[PDB]
From a paper:
The [name] outer-membrane transporter protein, [name], that recognises this siderophore has itself been identified as a vaccine candidate. The siderophore is known to be bound from the medium by the integral outer-membrane [name] protein. [name] has the typical outer-membrane TonB-dependent transporter (TBDT) fold with a β-barrel formed by 22 antiparallel strands, several extracellular loops, and a plug domain folded inside of the barrel. Acinetobactin is synthesized as a precursor, preacinetobactin, which rearranges non-enzymatically and irreversibly at pH >7 to give acinetobactin.
We incubated separate native protein crystals with preacinetobactin and acinetobactin compounds (both compounds preloaded with [name]+); surprisingly in both cases, we obtained the same structure: [name] bound to a heterocomplex [name]+-preacinetobactin-acinetobactin (1:1:1). The coordination of the iron is octahedral with four coordination atoms from preacinetobactin (one hydroxy group of the catecholate, the hydroxy of the hydroxamate, the nitrogen of the methyl oxazoline and one nitrogen (N1) of the imidazole group) and two hydroxyls from acinetobactin (the catecholate). The binding site is located inside the β-barrel similar to other siderophore complexes. [name] recognises the preacinetobactin through two direct hydrogen bonds between the hydroxamate group and Tyr312 of β7 and Arg253 of L3 and one interaction through a bridging water molecule between Asp375 and the nitrogen N2 of the imidazole, respectively. The binding site is predominantly hydrophobic in character with van der Waals interactions involving residues Trp97, Tyr125, Tyr314, Tyr378, Gly334, Gln335, Leu336, Arg379 and Leu684. Although there are no hydrogen bonds between the siderophores and the plug domain, two residues of the plug domain (Trp97 and Tyr125) do make van der Waals interactions with preacinetobactin. The acinetobactin molecule makes only one hydrogen bond (Arg253) and one van der Waals interaction (Leu684). There are no changes in the TonB region as a result of ligand binding. In the crystal structure, preacinetobactin fits into a complementary pocket; a simple molecular model shows that the same site would not bind acinetobactin due to extensive van der Waals clashes with Tyr312. The acinetobactin molecule is not itself recognised by the protein, rather it is the favorable coordination of the catechol group to the remaining two sites of [name]+ that drives complex formation.
Numbering used by the authors:
A (entry chain B), B (entry chain A), C (entry chain C): 33 to 703
The structure:
Amino acid sequence: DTYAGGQVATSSNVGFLGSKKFLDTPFNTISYTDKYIEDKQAKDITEVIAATDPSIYTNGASGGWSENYYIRGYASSTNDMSMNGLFGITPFYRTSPEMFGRVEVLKGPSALLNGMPPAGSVGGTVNLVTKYAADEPFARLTTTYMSDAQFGGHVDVGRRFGENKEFGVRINGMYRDGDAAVNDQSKESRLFSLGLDWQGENARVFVDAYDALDHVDGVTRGVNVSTAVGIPKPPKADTLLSPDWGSVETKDKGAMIRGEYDFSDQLMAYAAYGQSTTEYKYNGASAGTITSSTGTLSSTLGQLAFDVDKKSADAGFKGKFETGSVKHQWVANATYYNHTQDDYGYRIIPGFSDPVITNIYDPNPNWGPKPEFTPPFLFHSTLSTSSFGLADTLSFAQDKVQLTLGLRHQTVKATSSVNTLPENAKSATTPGVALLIKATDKISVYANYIEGLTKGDQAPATASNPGEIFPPQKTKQQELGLKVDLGTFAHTLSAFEITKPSSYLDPSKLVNNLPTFVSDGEQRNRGIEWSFFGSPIEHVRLMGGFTYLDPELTKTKSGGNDGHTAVAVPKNQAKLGAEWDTQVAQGTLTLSGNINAVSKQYINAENTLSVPGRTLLDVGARYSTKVEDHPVTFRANIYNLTNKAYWAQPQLTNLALGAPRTYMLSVSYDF
Amino acid sequence: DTYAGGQVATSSNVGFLGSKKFLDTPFNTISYTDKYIEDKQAKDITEVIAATDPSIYTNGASGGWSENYYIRGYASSTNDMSMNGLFGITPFYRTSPEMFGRVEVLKGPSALLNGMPPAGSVGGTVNLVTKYAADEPFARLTTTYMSDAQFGGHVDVGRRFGENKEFGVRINGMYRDGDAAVNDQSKESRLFSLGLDWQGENARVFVDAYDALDHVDGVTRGVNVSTAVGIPKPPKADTLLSPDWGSVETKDKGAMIRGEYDFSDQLMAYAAYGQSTTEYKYNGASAGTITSSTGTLSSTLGQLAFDVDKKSADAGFKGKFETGSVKHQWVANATYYNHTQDDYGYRIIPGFSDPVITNIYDPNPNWGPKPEFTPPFLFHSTLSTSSFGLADTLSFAQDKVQLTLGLRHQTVKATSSVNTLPENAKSATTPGVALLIKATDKISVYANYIEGLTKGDQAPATASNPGEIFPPQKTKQQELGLKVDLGTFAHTLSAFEITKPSSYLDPSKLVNNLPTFVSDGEQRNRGIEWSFFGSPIEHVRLMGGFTYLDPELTKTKSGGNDGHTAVAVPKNQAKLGAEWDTQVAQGTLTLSGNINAVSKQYINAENTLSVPGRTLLDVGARYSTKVEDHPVTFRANIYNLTNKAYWAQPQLTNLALGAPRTYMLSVSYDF
Amino acid sequence: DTYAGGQVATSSNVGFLGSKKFLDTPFNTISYTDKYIEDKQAKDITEVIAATDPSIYTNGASGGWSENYYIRGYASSTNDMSMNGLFGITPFYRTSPEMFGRVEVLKGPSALLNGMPPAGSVGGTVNLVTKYAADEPFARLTTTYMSDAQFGGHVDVGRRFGENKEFGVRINGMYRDGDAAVNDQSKESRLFSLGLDWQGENARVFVDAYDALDHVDGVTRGVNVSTAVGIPKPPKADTLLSPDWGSVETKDKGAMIRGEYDFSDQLMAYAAYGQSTTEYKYNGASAGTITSSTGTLSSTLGQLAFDVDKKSADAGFKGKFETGSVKHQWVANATYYNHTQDDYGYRIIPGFSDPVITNIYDPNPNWGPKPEFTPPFLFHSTLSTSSFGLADTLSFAQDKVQLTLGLRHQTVKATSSVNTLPENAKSATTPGVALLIKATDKISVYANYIEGLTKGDQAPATASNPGEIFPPQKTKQQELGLKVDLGTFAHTLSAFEITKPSSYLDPSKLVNNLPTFVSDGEQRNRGIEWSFFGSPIEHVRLMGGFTYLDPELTKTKSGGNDGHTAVAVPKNQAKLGAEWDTQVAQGTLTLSGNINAVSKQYINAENTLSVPGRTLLDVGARYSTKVEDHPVTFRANIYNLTNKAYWAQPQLTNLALGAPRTYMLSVSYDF
Ligand SMILES: [Fe+3]
Ligand SMILES: [Fe+3]
Ligand SMILES: [Fe+3]
């Protein structure tokens, strides 16, 4: 399954179409292996998928309250990841990757394939494939360090049972804790995970469960700027611009089961059910605001807790048939998601309502006392979605021309206990079509049209159309692409256009002498991507590429920002990761380097504030050997080697500092 | 004599008990070789004994007015090192290790073995073993660099003379000078040493003499904090928080002679005599005080000069005999120490009594003009100590059970030319017992009781018992331990409890309605130590360990701080040094790493101020080859490679910054 | 022609004496190859000639308005470089080295050999040798990075044509652009160069042409200090202490043609003609002035543009003959140089005459608005020089004793459109003599006397001798030296004394009771140099040395500064570059290090202000291999590894910051 280099896989899950090979997939897809994950010493999903992929962008801050990445220049919510194809299971805001055998990315929207994930983001789909027991018994201990003083370990054990090894058990345990690379920031993570499987003759069952904790002391929340004051030069990269006593914690627990049954080699049924819980707590700043070019910062304090219970299901049939010399491979499915949620919080903390005044350049800021965590209950809320989908792939001319057609019907309903406005389900129907031509056994050309869905907004009580709930809103993609597998090295070249609508109150459209709430907003992302992976010569691995992105606000409230560039995302990215192997005594030495170059990003939609591009370097070394015939691997990594200080745009606030120089060490031992 | 790896020796000097092997020593001991010293590029004793020993702690500042280390959580004064078993010879405050073939540490107090050293510290004994000429003629030149701009060299030459090579001459010369790694700090060091020996048939003589200079411009004195104001975040690690014009200089000259005479193979006499002089001069801050959380620093200035003339002697008899199936190995000795001293100084410098006001975060502090060095005479003082000791080691069962019993009488008298209060000698008797059992010839189990002595304090004129001089005060240790030599790798596991008394004026104990001066104070250090050294597999060296220490103030003035943790020392330490060798062309390449991790330390005895734990990394590379058949070694080291900024507690002031990232290069050539 | 190591050449151009080997040259000479240039990733000439040569000093600032270096402690103007032996062709202020096969240095003045270059500097002659097409067709692409975000590429292609490959074409293209290592400083460079040659039977023609751009945004201009205020501690090294909006741009275009004609093997004629244009523009600060010890900076603004059109020619004969057993090798030449120039500028910009007030330690300075570039015409000026020269080298004993004698007559005239005072040509005659003795074929001993010329000054209207124009002023050198070629490693040891006159109006020397304009000023530089290059052991390269310099102001106006040390230059330099090669897989791994240590430098001629010595470290790695038999080289370099912040003296202002830590990457591929 793994490609030359061991770092990328040759197939991925293309939503409900299932497992498809690189050259057979009319979408831009990549799948990273657990080997790559361990080689990066990746602590979250971002560190896996953003490192070498020029169609993915992160603001790159350390110890935020969530991960933050864009795919094809649109937000891709952490809420919207799948586990073994199923949504609503993964951790809410940050996921440590120890329990996954693959991390797969499908770029662009995919409503036909996947339906509408819970946060309705459209950038792309990240699918996390869990670990199951290999045939050979297995036990690996890894110890980890990260600067300044974060220590941890990870145990991974697998064994199969029964006379034909038809049962599997795979267990992962991980703990790490201590000060991180940012001043007064510490990071705690815990994971316990279970992967069980039964391989029957005509039937298969897979069970996965996990218990996870993510905790940051000195969480980074970021800061707001104005045009009046402007953006001052970034403090040094290890500065924390949020309260030192501020903290965030997320506890995530999840479990799922998949069953498959082969009726024949022309018909299979499958079902997947799962559930998860999230507990989020945050005590710290809601925002810092830079109020002077001398670096004065005004911070308001807030608290939030929320608890969410999630359930989800996906069941269907796959089959094959032939019509003359045309082979048909079809799938039909139904999906369900439900959550209930309680939110507690303060916008204004009693006794702590005055803003805390500091300066961004002060080495010893006074953040004041830490308020007790007592957020009062705010509201109960729910979300339900369901979908029914159908697709067929027609293969002509000895499978050299493959046409996929499908449609999905999607329903969604949200409720809130402080909403007096009407609450009603709404529905939309989303098609997709993809065409793939194998010009040779090494070269595929492909095109697709496909959509993404986002829950419709509700017009406020101040509108001509008060309380109107829009149907799910259609993001629309067209894509043309070329894929080349040279044998050990592979190239993708793809161009895309994706339009995403938005909704707003429009004063220019008067109905009963009132402003009308409309879905007339639009952002249009046009992009070219060239990317590559594998081994272009022996003992060398190379992964990366180049993208040009034009993210344009084509239609905005009152036309003010028509033709402007979208905030946050760069127009140009270039990324290269390279590894070089050489034999040294009784082992392999690998040297690694990464470069990550991006252009400037706008901070507001008026395009009157921006931050420059930056180029970041990383280096690593890896030594793999044996001690008394036990495999041993040593790994050292430095990220942001030049300790470049830069602003970039996080969620909810305008700016945050990128992560500083960070050292990571790990040693692993196979029992 | 040297253990596998070349870096540690298999025997050490156990006070007047003489040379004993690792498995035969009922104390926790380690001896480092000159090879280790050269490999660390150690510039002082601290860099030798603290690097991998988790029972030793230093605050780790660069360019202090002295070394500073604790052993088993108690101060071990630089004044209290021995040279070839004799006290009062070594440099007063800092010692560059070029002239030593071994640096030996015995952990815990050792009054029975060693008597009371001049400063009466009880943490451990550091014994410096000088170089003598090996049989083969020898000449090595080494050139040294340390960042930023310190250049130096060291010559080591030895030759033996006479027809049976019964005379030896060994000469060491060293100079280095230039800017160090701390801003505005420069370090000058000079050493000339002589080791002469004569090996007769029934007699031996050893002579050692040295002339040393230590000079620091921009000496670090450290800074004081209060509970009202608190401890601000450390400036960057290369900041100097003392006057840039401040300096310290110590000139040390010493010489000693040892003679041995064998009457038979059952009786030997020995005598050792030596003397030394110290000239200390300091012009700079007495203390910085942090007077605001913005980092305002108020620095008072002081000057000190003192001259001290020292004489030292140790003479006795050792013998063996048998009574039944019990072997006896006994010693009886007498020791003498005397110094005379003049002190000159200002507590208040005329024209410079106003503190200099700076801010600890200022890149451009104004330290004002440098006052002329004109300290006036303050007082003449003397210290005399003498002891008489007896010990016997009884061996049973083919030397598999060894019981040591001993006691020592200790006398001490101090005088001062400005003391109106009585001056009298005082005395104490200190016993010791140790038991060692060789379970196998690889495994020893041991236990000891032994004491340390400290000069008694004198009650002030304001007391109910005015002018009373206490006898030498007894620190008391109990220890249980286990040692294991696997062949090329060795373990020690030991547990200990050490109580140290203190004296104070007690307002709560009234006699004739006046406060009484009492010796009722107590600190109790309980510890577990696991440490190891050698080569656990081929081409690997590993040295380090783990300690837990509970240093508790069990009895304090008025009971205020009863149950508190002692200042300055961490409760937890983990240290690991590792080296890996590989063949590379015509030579051996060694890669090295060190980690040093400690937990938090309290800054006051009220335990209301503390500083966090910190982890420091070091890396090295070493290449040993030949050029035209002449051995050549290249050494490169980076210490504190993450350039971690941290506060820790020095002598006399509350806080000082740890040393920054420091680069060291050396090349050595054998003629 | 290249020495062991590939980095230095064995011959260089000794002015009109032509190509001479190392052991045949009675001057201190070195020639660096394009291989060395590529290995250093050199971006200007300074980075080639200053890195390892202890007789060369630069202040080392990043992004100045010109290069700045001294040779033997005297300014060597960038104006005064030669291209293939001809002056007035090279870029005016900064030269990127991509078009050169050699960079050659002759130390000390050389008027006999070279005449008077346009700026009349006397430190040394830098000669840049252009690239011509090798026999085998050639194409190399190189991509470059420099921190923070400067990217570039260089193409080098050559082919020969005709049946005997008697025509050659060699083309170089280079572009780089982006943010450099200094905050808010960007650097753009462009080069297109052409080297054409025809090799006939009796005759040869070489044509060279280039078009170059140098552009800096955030140009560093430096800052002035006073004795009243003093010199504060340097800000961090990547600080820009000139306006962020300030910029300099130079466009340089040049072309030259050389013809040679062999009349016989004993007589050759040659002629060279060339021209170049320079357009310089500068908009920014004229000076910052540090007006308080807290770091207050007062910056005045100015603008300058100048256009200069240059023409130059050199024609002559070389011949040999023998009379008895004495060989004669003679040369005779005539040289011409002319430039016309227009200057536009503001000393005071209308509407921007108020100084901009900042602080050198401010992370976020306000530099105010950028004034429109509108400098008005100031004056037209011209410079003409001509010379004729004759020299003979008399040799015997197979050239093992060589005596060189010569004379050159030099004429110069300057005009200016704002000079009312007389304008007249003036002349001087300058001799030279050198002696070389080959003690062996490995050892040469040599001595020389030779002069440098500088245009005479004109007495002001306030003098006794108003309007008098002095003749060309004679700098005078005497030198004694020793060269040793051991085979693969070479040494030079030389001692020199150079006196350089200056002129001033002297109130102490009255004629008709008026001050007299005199040439009574003198600076005298005495030096010892030990330097070396090549491979002392297999797989090692070593290049560097040590110099002591005594640069004394021996005679100054009024005698105030008599006996003081000259500004800007250190008295002591030590430089060492080392490379170590290891075979690994199918390629060579090279590791490199550089150290550069200098002593303190005076900032004023009163010698009441100075800045300390500093030591800088650099490290590098290089991997050279083949991919499908195509040569590939990877290079990584860090310069100023410790990121030392230091002041040094640039042109026109008192101080500027040295360049910060700078990372450089390049990859080259041969088609
Ligand atoms: Fe919120
Ligand atoms: Fe004192
Ligand atoms: Fe000027």
